[PDB]
């Protein structure tokens with residue numbers, strides 16, 4: 001199962017890891033994607049997860065959007081995990097760089113509660129523009145299921161652990 005994680009709370013764990021590499025190693029039941037409403041997996045975690053699936057995630061996602069329309073900011077959908085996981089939970093955190101309401105970050109993390117265990121990135125962090133320290137705080141105060149957080153950046157990982165209240 002998951003190895004090398006630092007335990008933050010009863011149910012939240014954290015590791016300085018590449019979530020693609022982590023997913024290929026563990027093959028978790030659920031890998032969380034830092035998705036946008038259109039499921040256009042261009043950059044950040046989404047671009048990296050999609051590239052690891054050889055674009056199969058994007059092909060599946062375009063069919064999902066053609067049938068269902070876009071997700072809501074704060075919403076999610078469950079699609080295939082391809083070669084990374086059994087399932088991919090595509091969760092849309094607010095993109096602060098698009099002027100989206102940061103208050104939707106709690107709604108976004110609530111989607112994790114539908115899954116007993118997940119491998120995930122910090123929602124709205126990275127290219128989504130939110131403060132990752134705030135994202136981790138909302139994660140630990142919202143998610144009640146077992147979440148294994150993969151933080152790519154070592155310097156950010158150290159800052160998150162050292163500042164964790």
Ligand SMILES: CC(C)C(=O)Nc1nnn(C)n1
Pocket residue numbers: 072073074075101103104107108
């Ligand atoms: C109270 C408001 C800001 C809120 O949480 N709205 C919401 N959360 N997820 N979706 C979708 N819509």
